[PDB]
Amino acid sequence: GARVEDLAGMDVFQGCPAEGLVSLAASVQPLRAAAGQVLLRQGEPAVSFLLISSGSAEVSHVGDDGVAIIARALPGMIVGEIALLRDSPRSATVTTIEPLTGWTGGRGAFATMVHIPGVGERLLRTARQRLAAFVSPIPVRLADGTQLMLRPVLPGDRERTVHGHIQFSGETLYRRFMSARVPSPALMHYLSEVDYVDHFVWVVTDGSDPVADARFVRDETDPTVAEIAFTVADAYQGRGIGSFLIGALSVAARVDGVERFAARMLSDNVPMRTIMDRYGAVWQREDVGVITTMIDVPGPGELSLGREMVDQINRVARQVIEAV
Numbered sequence: 505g506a507r508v509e510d511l512a513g514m515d516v517f518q519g520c521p522a523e524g525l526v527s528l529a530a531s532v533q534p535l536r537a538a539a540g541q542v543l544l545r546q547g548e549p550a551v552s553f554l555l556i557s558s559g560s561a562e563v564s565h566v567g568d569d570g571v572a573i574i575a576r577a578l579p580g581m582i583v584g585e586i587a588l589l590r591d592s593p594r595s596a597t598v599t600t601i602e603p604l605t606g607w608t609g610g611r612g613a614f615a616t617m618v619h620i621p622g623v624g625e626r627l628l629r630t631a632r633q634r635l636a637a638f639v640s641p642i643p644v645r646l647a648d649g650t651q652l653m654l655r656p657v658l659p660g661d662r663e664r665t666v667h668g669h670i671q672f673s674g675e676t677l678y679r680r681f682m683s684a685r686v687p688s689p690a691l692m693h694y695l696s697e698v699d700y701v702d703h704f705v706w707v708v709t710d711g712s713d714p715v716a717d718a719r720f721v722r723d724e725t726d727p728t729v730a731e732i733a734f735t736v737a738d739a740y741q742g743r744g745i746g747s748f749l750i751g752a753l754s755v756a757a758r759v760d761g762v763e764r765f766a767a768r769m770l771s772d773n774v775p776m777r778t779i780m781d782r783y784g785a786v787w788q789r790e791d792v793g794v795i796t797t798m799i800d801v802p803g804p805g806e807l808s809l810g811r812e813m814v815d816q817i818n819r820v821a822r823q824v825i826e827a828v
């Protein structure tokens with residue numbers, strides 16, 4: 505098999521004490537593939553997973569719309585884990601780009617891997633982030649006629665925004681973060697790389713570039729409550745996006761077992777206060793210049809969204825949340 509050292513470098517194994525990797529390392533087998541070799545095919549039954557040492561691969565998923573969604577598998581990453589988590593067929597076709605080496609294992613070695621402390625949770629989180637990219641974005645039409653799309657957040661949204669053309673002003677950032685400075689890389693990682701269970705995020709785009717986001721973060725002590733936050737790009741404000749997003753967030757919260765939303769905001773934020781007032785918010789003074797509220801996540805019919813839109817949002821939330 506491999507050396508414990510050889511596994512120690514894989515993403516999913518970071519921080520894992522050597523001892524826990526012993527049998528796994530002994531049980532995996534070496535793999536070498538040439539360039540342009542198909543490793544896995546979408547829809548096929550599953551046996552093995554692969555830990556990539558070197559080289560890389562294209563990942564290609566054909567969705568219901570018939571469009572192939574493309575991604576990359578890189579050195580340090582596992583591939584073929586999702587089918588083994590779900591007992592499903594392969595979610596994607598995986599083809600080597602350049603020559604690739606690594607280690608493979610079967611369902612037996614996979615069982616060892618998932619019981620390695622901390623690892624099962626990492627596998628699930630990464631699987632969710634991956635499957636999130638295969639969700640069909642939901643068309644949303646604003647009152648003013650603007651056509652946008654609604655989808656779960658993706659780790660890649662950090663890069664898209666930072667290098668994008670959509671502007672978030674100093675004022676917008678202060679209203680959102682209590683600082684006008686551009687959000688640090690560390691913060692942007694935190695905002696875009698999430699588990700969807702405890703921390704859930706919707707992104708609205710123009711069909712390419714993100715223009716807004718909404719998130720809830722489940723409270724540690726009381727799982728039935730979550731803290732919420734919203735951001736909308738300046739040019740996109742005042743068009744109904746925020747009002748839409750609180751509804752979408754409420755749909756996802758229902759799937760996630762979240763009964764109540766908590767919020768804090770500057771006392772001067774009129775648009776946000778108004779959005780929450782619709783849902784029955786009563787305001788407490790928290791710090792100086794900050795106010796807070798708790799509201800019940802609105803149930804059936806008291807959302808202005810309409811059934812078709814509600815069902816689409818519910819279907820997508822479940823796809824990311826419940827996939828594995």
Ligand SMILES: CC(=O)SCCNC(=O)CCNC(=O)[C@H](O)C(C)(C)COP(=O)(O)OP(=O)(O)OC[C@H]1O[C@@H](n2cnc3c(N)ncnc32)[C@H](O)[C@@H]1OP(=O)(O)O
Pocket residue numbers: 675676677679680732733734735736737740741742743744745746747748767768769770773774775776778779782
């Ligand atoms: C809990 C936290 O998230 S606090 C921090 C929130 N984030 C920020 O403040 C950052 C900068 N601003 C924004 O991101 C956005 O403006 C948000 C999230 C505050 C609001 O979203 P928007 O898309 O602009 O709001 P939207 O157009 O849906 O209208 C909001 C509501 O207030 C009203 N409104 C719209 N513009 C304004 C305005 N300039 N001033 C006061 N009220 C307004 C609308 O009537 C609407 O009411 P409705 O729910 O009955 O339809």
Ligand SMILES: Nc1ncnc2c1ncn2[C@@H]1O[C@@H]2COP(=O)(O)O[C@H]2[C@H]1O
Pocket residue numbers: 544550563575576577582583584585586587588593594595596597598633634635637638
């Ligand atoms: N968005 C993605 N990014 C990177 N790898 C992915 C992505 N989606 C799927 N995969 C990998 O492609 C594999 C195809 O088979 P599985 O569904 O077993 O497990 C899948 C993941 O390992």
